[PDB]
Amino acid sequence: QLSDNAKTLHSQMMSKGIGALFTQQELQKQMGIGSLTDLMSIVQELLDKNLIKLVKQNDELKFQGVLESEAQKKATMSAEEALVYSYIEASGREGIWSKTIKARTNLHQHVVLKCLKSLESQRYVKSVKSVKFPTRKIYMLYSLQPSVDELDIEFINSLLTIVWRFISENTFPNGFKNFENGPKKNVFYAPNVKNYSTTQEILEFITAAQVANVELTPSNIRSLCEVLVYDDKLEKVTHDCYRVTLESILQMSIFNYFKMFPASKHDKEVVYFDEWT
Amino acid sequence: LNEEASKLKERIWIGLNADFLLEQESKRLKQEADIA
Numbered sequence: 594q595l596s597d598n599a600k601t602l603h604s605q606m607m608s609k610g611i612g613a614l615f616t617q618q619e620l621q622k623q624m625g626i627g628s629l630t631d632l633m634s635i636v637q638e639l640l641d642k643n644l645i646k647l648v649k650q651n652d653e654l655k656f657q658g659v660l661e662s663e664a665q666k667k668a669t670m671s672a673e674e675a676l677v678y679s680y681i682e683a684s685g686r687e688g689i690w691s692k693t694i695k696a697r698t699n700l701h702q703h704v705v706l707k708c709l710k711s712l713e714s715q716r717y718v719k720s721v722k723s724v725k726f727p728t729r730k731i732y733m734l735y736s737l738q739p740s741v742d743e744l745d746i747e748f749i750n751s752l753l754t755i756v757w758r759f760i761s762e763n764t765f766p767n768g769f770k771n772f773e774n775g776p777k778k779n780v781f782y783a784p785n786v787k788n789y790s791t792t793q794e795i796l797e798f799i800t801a802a803q804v805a806n807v808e809l810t811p812s813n814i815r816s817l818c819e820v821l822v823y824d825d826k827l828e829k830v831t832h833d834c835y836r837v838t839l840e841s842i843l844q845m846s847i848f849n850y851f852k853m854f855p856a857s858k859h860d861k862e863v864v865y866f867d868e869w870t
Numbered sequence: 871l872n873e874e875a876s877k878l879k880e881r882i883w884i885g886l887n888a889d890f891l892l893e894q895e896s897k898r899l900k901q902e903a904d905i906a
Contacts, residue, residue: 716903737904 594826598627599644606645606658618654641669648683673700673708681718681732687740688733700863708778743813752804753817756791757826757837760800763789764837770845789832 602624605611611619620632639645643664648655663682667675677698680691694705694862699854707832709732718780719735723744743749761768791798795814820833821827828836843851857863871879884891 714902719906735906 595635595638595642598632600818602632602635602639603644603658605654613648613657614651614656615656617656618653620656641652650663670711670715671708673704674712677705677800678712678717682734684733686737687734688731690729743809747819753821753826756795756817757821758789759795760827760835761837761841763791764839768841770841775864776839782835788831788834790830790836792833 602620604622605623606615611623617749620627624632636645638648644659644701645662646657648657667679670678677694680694691709692702693704694700695702698705708720713757715722716735718732719738720730721733721738721740723729723731723740724745765777765780777784791814793811796809796811801808818827818829822829822835825838825840827837830836843849845851853861
């Protein structure tokens with residue numbers, strides 16, 4: 594019966610529905626009482642009546658009970674979105690990119706646009722600009738904003754100079770660059786015994802905040818410190834331990850970049866690195 | 871006009887303009903939806 598087999602077949606879905614992976618053989622696993630066409634006729638009608646739900650994956654076809662809000666929702670939607678919106682809401686967390694829909698849906702761009710505009714007004718979708726290039730405008734359900742990603746853009750080096758302050762302290766006592774010999778006075782006692790770094794410890798120092806942001810993972814810490822290894826703001830000793838390159842001196846023949854300025858006006862005798870090329 | 875002319879008259883006006891107000895304040899709710 595439409596109602597009876599609907600409600601009791603909706604009962605296995607609302608109760609369990611064998612999760613997402615439920616196939617039609619899994620229906621016979623639970624209800625095998627239904628004859629081949631009897632169970633399938635009401636299957637087809639309940640999808641036409643937007644009561645059962647089908648997913649296209651792996652082998653056979655997945656099924657789940659409708660929330661009935663999405664049911665009348667897509668029933669209100671046109672035949673375009675009926676698959677298109679449903680096809681996109683099957684994209685899950687990562688959503689889907691526009692132009693690849695045409696090869697999947699076999700449509701123009703012009704025809705898929707206006708319905709995407711409706712779903713914008715319907716607010717069941719939103720344009721998402723992800724880490725990859727902003728020519729995309731990939732679409733996912735407006736209900737969620739998951740992605741794969743700090744934020745790609747700036748205000749990082751801000752906290753960089755912060756961690757460099759701390760680890761700069763961590764080496765010898767504090768800067769002491771006022772007069773000629775302030776360093777370490779041979780590192781307290783035994784300028785050997787002291788093996789020092791943050792690793793774990795930094796996040797305890799990261800607790801300071803004074804900046805609007807979330808927390809940060811220990812793996813990402815190292816990913817930061819490596820950059821300063823490359824810039825040589827600090828040194829990498831013994832795995833996750835670290836040192837500083839004592840270029841607090843550049844903070845401030847005989848060789849270094851800073852502490853040097855040219856004439857660079859008039860006189861025709863100079864040294865460039867170009868004009869050999 | 872008197873106060874009743876305002877009320878009942880505005881009652882008719884608003885009565886037929888509440889569809890304009892519908893998308894109006896509905897859009898005002900969409901303003902909150904802009905956060906997400």
